[PDB]
Design an enzyme around this catalytic site. Sequence first.
Site, PDB file in Angstrom:
ATOM      1  N   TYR A   1      -9.262  12.440   3.701  1.00 28.37           N
ATOM      2  CA  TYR A   1      -9.396  12.291   2.251  1.00 28.37           C
ATOM      3  C   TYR A   1     -10.650  13.010   1.722  1.00 28.37           C
ATOM      4  O   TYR A   1     -10.669  13.554   0.616  1.00 28.37           O
ATOM      5  CB  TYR A   1      -9.370  10.801   1.849  1.00 28.37           C
TER       6      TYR A   1
ATOM      7  N   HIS B   1      -7.000   1.169   5.619  1.00 32.29           N
ATOM      8  CA  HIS B   1      -6.900   2.204   6.643  1.00 32.29           C
ATOM      9  C   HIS B   1      -7.459   1.714   7.980  1.00 32.29           C
ATOM     10  O   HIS B   1      -7.171   2.285   9.036  1.00 32.29           O
ATOM     11  CB  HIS B   1      -7.638   3.463   6.196  1.00 32.29           C
TER      12      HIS B   1
ATOM     13  N   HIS C   1       0.242  11.968  -5.774  1.00 33.96           N
ATOM     14  CA  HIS C   1      -0.292  12.111  -4.433  1.00 33.96           C
ATOM     15  C   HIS C   1       0.846  11.965  -3.404  1.00 33.96           C
ATOM     16  O   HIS C   1       0.958  12.753  -2.453  1.00 33.96           O
ATOM     17  CB  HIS C   1      -1.399  11.084  -4.216  1.00 33.96           C
ATOM     18  N   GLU C   2       1.640  10.902  -3.570  1.00 37.42           N
ATOM     19  CA  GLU C   2       2.732  10.592  -2.669  1.00 37.42           C
ATOM     20  C   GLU C   2       3.852  11.616  -2.775  1.00 37.42           C
ATOM     21  O   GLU C   2       4.410  11.992  -1.757  1.00 37.42           O
ATOM     22  CB  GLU C   2       3.245   9.188  -2.898  1.00 37.42           C
TER      23      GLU C   2
ATOM     24  N   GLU D   1      -2.908  15.671   2.379  1.00 36.97           N
ATOM     25  CA  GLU D   1      -3.452  14.808   1.359  1.00 36.97           C
ATOM     26  C   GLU D   1      -3.704  15.555   0.058  1.00 36.97           C
ATOM     27  O   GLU D   1      -3.788  14.894  -0.990  1.00 36.97           O
ATOM     28  CB  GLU D   1      -4.711  14.125   1.886  1.00 36.97           C
TER      29      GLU D   1
ATOM     30  N   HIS E   1       0.855  -1.200   0.000  1.00 36.04           N
ATOM     31  CA  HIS E   1       0.000   0.000   0.000  1.00 36.04           C
ATOM     32  C   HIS E   1       0.886   1.243   0.000  1.00 36.04           C
ATOM     33  O   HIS E   1       1.707   1.372   0.866  1.00 36.04           O
ATOM     34  CB  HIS E   1      -0.953  -0.012   1.205  1.00 36.04           C
ATOM     35  N   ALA E   2       0.746   2.109  -0.998  1.00 28.29           N
ATOM     36  CA  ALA E   2       1.658   3.223  -1.226  1.00 28.29           C
ATOM     37  C   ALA E   2       1.689   4.204  -0.041  1.00 28.29           C
ATOM     38  O   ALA E   2       0.666   4.594   0.491  1.00 28.29           O
ATOM     39  CB  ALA E   2       1.275   3.956  -2.498  1.00 28.29           C
TER      40      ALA E   2
ATOM     41  N   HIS F   1       3.088  14.557  -0.602  1.00 31.06           N
ATOM     42  CA  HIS F   1       3.489  14.401   0.786  1.00 31.06           C
ATOM     43  C   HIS F   1       4.987  14.707   0.896  1.00 31.06           C
ATOM     44  O   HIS F   1       5.395  15.379   1.827  1.00 31.06           O
ATOM     45  CB  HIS F   1       3.291  12.977   1.282  1.00 31.06           C
TER      46      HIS F   1
END
EC number: 3.4.15.1
Length: 575
Positions: free
Chosen positions: A481, A471, A344-345, A372, A314-315, A348
């Site tokens: 989210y 999650h 998305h990552e 996020e 899971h990324a 962060h």
Amino acid sequence: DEAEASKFVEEYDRTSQVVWNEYAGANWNYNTNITTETSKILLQKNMQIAQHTLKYGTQARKFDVNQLQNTTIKRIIKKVQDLERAALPAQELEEYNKILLDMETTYSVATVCHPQGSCLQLEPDLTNVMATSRKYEDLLWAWEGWRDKAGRAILQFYPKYVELINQAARLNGYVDAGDSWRSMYETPSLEQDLERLFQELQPLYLNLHAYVRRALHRHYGAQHINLEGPIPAHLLGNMWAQTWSNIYDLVVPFPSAPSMDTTEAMLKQGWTPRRMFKEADDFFTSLGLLPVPPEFWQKSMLEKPDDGREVVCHASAWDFYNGKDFRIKQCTTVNLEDLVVAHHEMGHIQYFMQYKDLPVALREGANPGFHEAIGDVLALSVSTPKHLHSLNLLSGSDEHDINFLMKMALDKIAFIPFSYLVDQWRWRVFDGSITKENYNQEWWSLRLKYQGLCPPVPRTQGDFDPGAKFHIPSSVPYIRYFVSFIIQFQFHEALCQAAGHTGPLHKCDIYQSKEAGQRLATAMKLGFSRPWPEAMQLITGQPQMSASAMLSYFKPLLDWLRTENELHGEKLGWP
Ligand SMILES: *[C@@H]1O[C@H](CO[C@@H]2O[C@@H](C)[C@@H](O)[C@@H](O)[C@@H]2O)[C@@H](O[C@@H]2O[C@H](CO)[C@@H](O[C@@H]3O[C@H](CO)[C@@H](O)[C@H](O)[C@@H]3O)[C@H](O)[C@H]2NC(C)=O)[C@H](O)[C@H]1NC(C)=O
Ligand SMILES: CCC[C@H](N[C@@H](C)C(=O)N1[C@H](C(=O)O)C[C@@H]2CCCC[C@@H]21)C(=O)O
Ligand SMILES: *[C@@H]1O[C@H](CO)[C@@H](O)[C@H](O)[C@H]1NC(C)=O
Ligand SMILES: [Cl-]
Ligand SMILES: [Cl-]
Ligand SMILES: [Zn+2]
């Protein structure tokens, strides 16, 4: 005394860097290499970071924050006074840490097997089934199979997790874990504010839902789709039906206007995971934002190891708390969905880099939503037909335009109810109004009420469908989210205006805009140092969360859906 408080925050900061850095090391090593050994060192470093947290936390609580004049110091000390799990007695802390590890491990190594055939993991195999199968029975096998193997195996752990997480929350002055989670927004009106945002998205959502239901009816037949009822949860191209863009082929508004096979394009043009991250890096730097450091390219795990090593696929994005080492851990498959995920990552990572010089207590997003939202904002520009054309992944017309907006809606709008319900459920679990006797039933009751979805197979005793979503066993809050999806559109709108775009908001591409980069950077630099309305004001020139940007983006689609649904006589909603 101000001077003793200032020295304490200095001592907290230097000592936290070291211990957090070690903890991050061991967690990383487990996550990238699940073994008895790395698991043991992890549980060990858990005890170490707790001992630090308990020491400083007990110190912080002796300060009367009421008497502190410096507001930065006051805020640091107030936050350090919350110990989280390190408030538990040693026995309970050990059990809690073991429960978390066990839940995450269970999820991350579950497989679904054909008898006498091959076993499928969630990534890539089961994900690819949910995305590309168009046969009811095969979708069903994957959907039920995953719940049977992941979800039902988490159930043995979850009551005890709830008890311990709540006990820790109470020992930090909260009424339950859900109260502690919501407090991260520092917004007393949160629940109401989110409810109103949810209500404003209902026109779009119900119209989308009805049109997709019709299209499903055409493909799967009248005996399997009730045109006035919920949609079966296995048919939307995603294990959780949380995003629907994999069934774009079934719901194309204008099938006369064909769209490139972007996956085949990526594959045919030799895209790799590395290329996907490098393009995200280019986009951030085009805005005048920071490049990821060389160390990131050496240390990150950007594809699933082939060497028998078992991993958390899971990324996720990692801050090692030394201001130099940032990484991503993702089992990247070469397709558009993952390219958005990579952005998305990288968002962060960009935040970790912009706030790396704050005290570690203030190294977080203005609120978890902001963390996020960053990468998503850029991905909205990446997703545009014009940007994808420039990447050579796509080849004017109103027809292509409505098609595009439909593709975006199937991701953005469809996620609104799913992202809202996950912590509606968990908040009620934590506050004790959902017991373990009806975990599952209350889950499906909200799946129905918010998303208009029903289970394709009736649930039985022992099912725990929530446990089949990452999650939940990993204890990662979800409402962030929902906030993200609303404010990301407000950020896009503001960035587009700053960049001089005019015309419909959905046509904006902010690539290379320094004006747009500069707004993001000054907001991300605040970290958690101020109330999040200030970071909102910096980006958007006003301080509220608002659905009006996301509605404005999708307005042409809303008009088209209404005309289409009316023409077909759809009855919006379900009982
Ligand atoms: C309240 O206290 C904060 C925090 O003070 C800092 O942390 C304490 C624990 C002690 O170690 C303090 O001695 C220490 O400065 C004050 O904020 C800080 O203000 C300074 C100066 O205004 C900021 O410095 C900047 O530093 C950059 C480099 O990063 C320079 O290039 C700039 O030119 C600029 O001088 C510093 O960022 C800021 N620190 C934080 C973490 O916010 C604050 O001023 C004070 N408030 C009152 C009432 O005076
Ligand atoms: C430890 C949290 C990891 C999480 N991993 C991603 C892949 C994730 O779980 N999600 C959420 C999810 O996949 O359920 C939706 C969210 C918005 C779109 C991109 C992917 C984002 C994150 O980076 O926030
Ligand atoms: C994985 O972990 C084992 C056990 O801790 C270790 O000995 C081995 O070197 C690791 N493999 C990788 C890829 O680091
Ligand atoms: Cl489910
Ligand atoms: Cl959150
Ligand atoms: Zn994220």
